[PDB]
Design a protein around this ligand. Structure first.
Ligand SMILES: NS(=O)(=O)c1cc2c(cc1Cl)NCNS2(=O)=O
Ligand SMILES: NS(=O)(=O)c1cc2c(cc1Cl)NCNS2(=O)=O
Ligand SMILES: N[C@@H](CCC(=O)O)C(=O)O
Ligand SMILES: N[C@@H](CCC(=O)O)C(=O)O
Ligand SMILES: [Zn+2]
Ligand SMILES: [Zn+2]
Lengths: 258, 258
């Protein structure tokens, strides 16, 4: 049976290939995770079909209804067999689905326009001139909503009660806000996405500070799935052979424009 | 029933407290892993005895007989119900034991005496005057034995055939050799341990270059054990509450000497 693979559109993990309205199947796509789905598949020995996630979110449980949206949801309600994507391993998610070991490391970092008077997270908390928010429906938002640290609680208290909303719907949207906002908007996003943007034209963004925390992206399968075992091992193999780090070079740096 | 926790002596994960003879049971020990295991045991609601693995090793497999030694063996062969140490998640191990998600990140690094004319793993591979070795029966040794990267196979080639042996039985021995060799021995060891040593008197060693790869420390449990699960959620919990980041700063940095 062809494995159905859910994933989300996020450069440079998965990206529409210049000509698509063309080729077809999995060929439509390219990017770090597309490349990873290929070797994963070969080593586990299965055929697969990439499909992009509907609502285009990563996945939170909606407090109201208690329904899972996003890629996590696609797994939880049986619409897919596996998620290969920038999907953060977190306690709440590990409760409803199974995670492989991490294939990539990352942490919550700050993005600012170059020339912004900001050096750290402590720095953002101590001020009002510069607004900051996070993506909606992701790890980073929850990280704040649930944190017990001095700086991170205040930061949250601000973000949840600010108007207009400091939250964006997509990473692209949050990046464009930084640029358009003339250095009066910082964006809290994960490190890997920061470092990637920092390397793209027009080169007006930059990542400042040390990460606020430490975590990783795992590949996801339905809780109690049989793939969960092979897939995991596939990840370990590919890591020790050097693949994951060779691929990070290919999509992050060997492509640099800065 | 009391959970037998196996572990190894390795600064600053597990250490004999300055009252080595005067105290008893778990009290004898202090350190990063001693604190971690305490919170693990609190959050999973069990009691435990810490014992130190006998052959003071981490765990490799005899190619002769195929028997496991060190902590991996203590799990494999029933002598212990869990291993709480700086034990590295690798692929051969993950075949015979279960690993929690990472609780700490690390990579392979070079330690040299200050002043040594080395900058990278490649610089080492390009000469013979300076000898370089690694801990025996560890993740690192296996990394080289199994690496297909040009620079690492040539390193492995030199190490596997060097005399006197470039290998060492304890990280402590490896360090001693670096110091006493007047900069003619370098030691390939894990970034974590390196960062720690760097900040202790006599302050004569120094981490160099970047990390030769990425990986992590996991809590291991016998394949298909009941603790395996509880233990994992426990790690995930503690990582979010920040404890792991707080713990690390206590043992590595609030402990600095240079
Ligand atoms: N250094 S890390 O925690 O980001 C990491 C851990 C593992 C990887 C990859 C990374 Cl980057 N894959 C192989 N095994 S692991 O310990 O889960
Ligand atoms: N970035 S990492 O691979 O070193 C890492 C991964 C995890 C942590 C902590 C770290 Cl530093 N704990 C929570 N879940 S995780 O993905 O296993
Ligand atoms: N990548 C995150 C969401 C985006 C963010 O919060 O930065 C996740 O997998 O949940
Ligand atoms: N942490 C390693 C041992 C130390 C090393 O290999 O440098 C292991 O789990 O085997
Ligand atoms: Zn298009
Ligand atoms: Zn606690």
């Amino acid at each position: 049976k062809t494995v159905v693979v859910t994933t989300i559109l996020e450069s440079p993990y998965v990206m529409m290939k210049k000509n698509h309205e063309m080729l077809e199947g999995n060929e439509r796509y390219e990017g770090y995770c597309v490349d990873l789905a290929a070797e994963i598949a070969k080593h586990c020995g299965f055929k697969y079909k990439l499909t992009i996630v509907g609502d285009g979110k990563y996945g939170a449980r909606d407090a109201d209804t208690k329904i899972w949206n996003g890629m996590v949801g696609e797994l939880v309600y049986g619409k897919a067999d596996i998620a290969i994507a920038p999907l953060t391993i977190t306690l709440v998610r590990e409760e409803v689905i199974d995670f492989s070991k991490p294939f990539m490391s990352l942490g919550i970092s700050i993005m600012i326009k170059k020339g912004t008077p900001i050096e750290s997270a402590e720095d953002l908390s101590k001020q009002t001139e510069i607004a900051y928010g996070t993506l909606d429906s992701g790890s980073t938002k929850e990280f704040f909503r649930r944190s017990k640290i001095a700086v991170f609680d205040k930061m949250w208290t601000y973000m949840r009660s600010a108007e207009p909303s400091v939250f964006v719907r997509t990473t692209a949207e949050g990046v464009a806000r930084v640029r358009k906002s003339k250095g009066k908007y910082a964006y809290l996003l994960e490190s890997t996405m920061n470092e990637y943007i920092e390397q793209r034209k027009p080169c007006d963004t930059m990542k400042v500070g040390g990460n606020l925390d430490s975590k990783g992206y795992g590949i996801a399968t339905p809780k109690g799935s049989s793939l969960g075992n092979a897939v995991n091992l596939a990840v370990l193999k590919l890591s020790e052979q050097g693949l994951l780090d060779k691929l990070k070079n290919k999509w992050w740096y060997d492509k640099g424009e800065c």
